[PDB]
Amino acid sequence: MPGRAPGSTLARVGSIPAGDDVLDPDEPTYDLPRVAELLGVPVSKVAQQLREGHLVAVRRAGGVVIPQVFFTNSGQVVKSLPGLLTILHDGGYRDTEIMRWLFTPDPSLTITRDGSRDAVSNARPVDALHAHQAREVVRRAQAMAY
């Protein structure tokens, strides 16, 4: 049928919440001053990234942190990461939910560990995206929402 969809622009911007820390506190994390340090930008620009749906932050004990793993080994944001956020944002998934599936090692996932050559069955999808095996993560994101 002739029926165009008025969904030309996806809503990839909104208010991204910060709530329950999914990663364990011993896992490497970034903090607002540290990200400001990393990108060479003010804290306010870091907050803008968060407002633009480029990055996600969670709260541990009271402090707001951003997992190291959201940034590549080059200290850059993963290109398709705001992309996953786009689909999950449209699906109405909160910060805690995003990291939920993302930090859960999947038994049916067998990927090579980032930095390594070897394959790990039942690994965290984070290593997949960090090693540009992101498509499986995008798939998992899609399956999680739509």
Side-chain angles (χ1 to χ4, degrees):
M1 65 175 298
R4 285 68 64 182
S8 44
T9 305
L10 293 179
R12 48 151 292 204
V13 297
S15 304
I16 292 70
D20 181 56
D21 53 281
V22 180
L23 46 57
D24 179 271
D26 184 72
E27 304 302 281
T29 43
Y30 269 124
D31 295 78
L32 298 178
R34 277 53 173 125
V35 182
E37 283 181 78
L38 180 64
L39 300 178
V41 300
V43 182
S44 299
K45 282 181 57 63
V46 179
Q48 287 299 91
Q49 300 294 29
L50 179 61
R51 302 305 300 192
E52 296 296 308
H54 288 135
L55 192 59
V56 184
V58 288
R59 194 178 185 223
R60 56 177 292 212
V64 181
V65 286
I66 301 172
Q68 287 286 331
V69 297
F70 274 60
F71 294 92
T72 53
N73 188 30
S74 44
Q76 189 188 32
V77 180
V78 183
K79 180 184 64 181
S80 187
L81 183 161
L84 77 86
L85 300 179
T86 302
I87 179 281
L88 280 300
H89 184 253
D90 181 77
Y93 289 91
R94 68 186 70 153
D95 58 286
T96 309
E97 294 289 79
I98 307 306
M99 301 185 186
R100 181 182 181 171
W101 48 265
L102 189 51
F103 286 75
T104 301
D106 184 73
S108 49
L109 182 65
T110 305
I111 50 178
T112 179
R113 196 79 201 235
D114 171 73
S116 187
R117 60 179 184 197
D118 293 272
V120 181
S121 182
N122 185 86
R124 64 183 184 194
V126 180
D127 276 64
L129 64 87
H130 200 111
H132 297 124
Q133 307 177 91
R135 304 179 184 212
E136 180 62 73
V137 184
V138 179
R139 171 191 173 219
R140 202 63 51 127
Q142 293 174 329
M144 182 64 178
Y146 296 92

